[PDB]
Design a protein around this motif. Structure first.
Motif, PDB file in Angstrom:
ATOM      1  N   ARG A   1      -8.060   6.514  -7.290  1.00 32.09           N
ATOM      2  CA  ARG A   1      -8.299   6.194  -5.884  1.00 32.09           C
ATOM      3  C   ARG A   1      -9.082   4.895  -5.741  1.00 32.09           C
ATOM      4  O   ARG A   1      -8.775   4.064  -4.876  1.00 32.09           O
ATOM      5  CB  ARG A   1      -9.047   7.339  -5.202  1.00 32.09           C
ATOM      6  CG  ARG A   1      -8.293   8.658  -5.195  1.00 32.09           C
ATOM      7  CD  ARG A   1      -9.029   9.725  -4.400  1.00 32.09           C
ATOM      8  NE  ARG A   1      -8.236  10.946  -4.285  1.00 32.09           N
ATOM      9  CZ  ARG A   1      -7.209  11.102  -3.452  1.00 32.09           C
ATOM     10  NH1 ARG A   1      -6.835  10.114  -2.651  1.00 32.09           N
ATOM     11  NH2 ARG A   1      -6.548  12.250  -3.424  1.00 32.09           N
TER      12      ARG A   1
ATOM     13  N   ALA B   1       0.476   4.390  -2.397  1.00 26.29           N
ATOM     14  CA  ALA B   1       0.393   5.729  -1.826  1.00 26.29           C
ATOM     15  C   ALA B   1       1.436   6.652  -2.442  1.00 26.29           C
ATOM     16  O   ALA B   1       1.201   7.860  -2.564  1.00 26.29           O
ATOM     17  CB  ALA B   1       0.560   5.661  -0.308  1.00 26.29           C
TER      18      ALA B   1
ATOM     19  N   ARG C   1       0.624   9.843  -4.588  1.00 25.60           N
ATOM     20  CA  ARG C   1       1.193  11.109  -4.137  1.00 25.60           C
ATOM     21  C   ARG C   1       1.781  11.890  -5.308  1.00 25.60           C
ATOM     22  O   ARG C   1       1.544  13.096  -5.448  1.00 25.60           O
ATOM     23  CB  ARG C   1       2.256  10.854  -3.070  1.00 25.60           C
ATOM     24  CG  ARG C   1       2.653  12.095  -2.289  1.00 25.60           C
ATOM     25  CD  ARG C   1       3.804  11.824  -1.325  1.00 25.60           C
ATOM     26  NE  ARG C   1       3.613  10.585  -0.569  1.00 25.60           N
ATOM     27  CZ  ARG C   1       4.267   9.445  -0.784  1.00 25.60           C
ATOM     28  NH1 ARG C   1       5.190   9.350  -1.736  1.00 25.60           N
ATOM     29  NH2 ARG C   1       3.998   8.387  -0.031  1.00 25.60           N
TER      30      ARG C   1
ATOM     31  N   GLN D   1      -7.672   1.545  -3.860  1.00 24.11           N
ATOM     32  CA  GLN D   1      -8.247   1.101  -2.595  1.00 24.11           C
ATOM     33  C   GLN D   1      -8.639  -0.373  -2.643  1.00 24.11           C
ATOM     34  O   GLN D   1      -8.505  -1.087  -1.643  1.00 24.11           O
ATOM     35  CB  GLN D   1      -9.453   1.974  -2.245  1.00 24.11           C
ATOM     36  CG  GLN D   1     -10.092   1.660  -0.895  1.00 24.11           C
ATOM     37  CD  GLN D   1     -11.524   1.170  -1.014  1.00 24.11           C
ATOM     38  OE1 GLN D   1     -12.099   1.139  -2.102  1.00 24.11           O
ATOM     39  NE2 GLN D   1     -12.109   0.781   0.115  1.00 24.11           N
TER      40      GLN D   1
ATOM     41  N   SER E   1       0.817  -1.204   0.000  1.00 23.20           N
ATOM     42  CA  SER E   1       0.000   0.000   0.000  1.00 23.20           C
ATOM     43  C   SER E   1       0.854   1.259   0.000  1.00 23.20           C
ATOM     44  O   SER E   1       0.371   2.321  -0.401  1.00 23.20           O
ATOM     45  CB  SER E   1      -0.928   0.000   1.214  1.00 23.20           C
ATOM     46  OG  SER E   1      -1.739  -1.160   1.224  1.00 23.20           O
ATOM     47  N   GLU E   2       2.111   1.164   0.438  1.00 24.53           N
ATOM     48  CA  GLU E   2       2.979   2.337   0.444  1.00 24.53           C
ATOM     49  C   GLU E   2       3.435   2.689  -0.966  1.00 24.53           C
ATOM     50  O   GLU E   2       3.578   3.871  -1.300  1.00 24.53           O
ATOM     51  CB  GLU E   2       4.181   2.096   1.354  1.00 24.53           C
ATOM     52  CG  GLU E   2       5.132   3.283   1.458  1.00 24.53           C
ATOM     53  CD  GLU E   2       4.416   4.591   1.770  1.00 24.53           C
ATOM     54  OE1 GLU E   2       4.372   5.478   0.888  1.00 24.53           O
ATOM     55  OE2 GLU E   2       3.889   4.732   2.895  1.00 24.53           O
TER      56      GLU E   2
END
Length: 318
Positions: free
Chosen positions: A198, A7, A11, A202, A3-4
């Motif tokens: 997104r 992210a 970002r 998710q 998930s990083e």
């Protein structure tokens, strides 16, 4: 752990979207342009509902203007009548002074009272005259509008100013709204692709570690679409700024037309809302000057009677 990575991707993309959106907003807000373009045009030809309401309301009482004008007619007649009677009183009194001095060379109470009352009513008329002229000024201010709202609608609409843009100006405006439509489409697309990113991030739950380089590939397509969206902005902004250059003058024109439209509408509303006051002040004038005319006519009668009695009492010459 994975998930990083997502992210991170998100970002970066959000940094790009935020910069581009920032510049875009600076240009758009600096140009006073909005997809809800303030060209109206349609509005100029449509009578405001509130105005048509007022017209229909006047149609149920068609004796508005008539009664007001007639009231002012009576008032004016009584006004000049009062002036005439005052003048006649003055003349009679000066003749009596003359005859009295002639008589006194070769040979009262009521007379003094009469003279005082005359000066009194002269002053009353003097002070009321300002009120009267103010009433006439208001009459000029509103009667025309009250007559317009009482007539056919096509004339009310005719009173409103309309545009007369050359075909060149029309083309300019159409181009401007075309480019503004492109900008709006671009923004909607931008937020849409953001939400798609997104949503896919998710729900992307997965189960040596080079598997990341393979599973992050499902975002390459949305990244292509987003880069295309963000890279198209500079050019549509160039086009929009050029069109805006060609639009400044029509902006001036349509702005002045806006303020003129609003001022016309506001004056008509003001007149409609002033009618009642006009009528009550006209009735007040009619009462004031009907009573004053009564008192001045009575004073004239007593003046004629007193001066005749004095000229008759000059019988010592017989």
């Amino acid at each position: 752990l994975y998930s990083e990575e997502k992210a991170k991707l998100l970002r970066e993309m959000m940094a790009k979207i935020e910069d581009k959106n920032e510049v875009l907003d600076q240009f758009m807000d600096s140009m006073q342009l909005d997809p809800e373009t303030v060209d109206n045009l349609d509005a100029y030809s449509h009578i405001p509902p509130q105005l048509m309401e007022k017209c229909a309301a006047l149609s149920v009482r068609p004796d508005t203007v008539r009664n007001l004008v007639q009231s002012m007619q009576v008032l004016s007649g009584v006004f000049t009548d009062v002036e005439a009677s005052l003048k006649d009183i003055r003349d009679l009194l000066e003749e009596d002074e003359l005859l009295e001095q002639k008589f006194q060379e070769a040979v009262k109470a009521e007379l003094a009272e009469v003279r005082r009352e005359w000066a009194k009513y002269m002053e009353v008329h003097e002070k009321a005259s300002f009120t009267n002229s103010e009433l006439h000024r208001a009459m000029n201010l509103h009667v025309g509008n009250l007559r317009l709202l009482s007539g056919p609608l096509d004339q009310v609409r005719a009173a409103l100013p309309t545009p007369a843009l050359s075909p060149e100006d029309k083309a300019v405006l159409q181009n401007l709204k075309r480019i503004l439509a492109k900008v709006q489409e671009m923004r909607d697309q931008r937020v849409s692709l953001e939400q798609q990113l997104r949503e896919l991030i998710q729900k992307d739950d997965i189960t040596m570690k080079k598997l990341f380089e393979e599973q992050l590939k499902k975002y390459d397509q949305l990244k292509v679409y987003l880069e295309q969206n963000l890279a198209a902005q500079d050019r549509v902004l160039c086009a929009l700024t050029e069109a805006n250059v060609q639009y400044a003058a029509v902006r001036r024109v349509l702005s002045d037309l806006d303020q003129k439209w609003n001022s016309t509408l506001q004056t008509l509303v003001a007149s409609y809302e002033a009618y009642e006051d006009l009528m009550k002040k006209s009735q007040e004038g009619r009462d004031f000057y009907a009573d004053l005319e009564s008192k001045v006519a009575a004073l004239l009668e007593r003046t004629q009677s007193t001066c005749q009695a004095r000229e008759a009492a000059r019988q010592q010459l017989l």
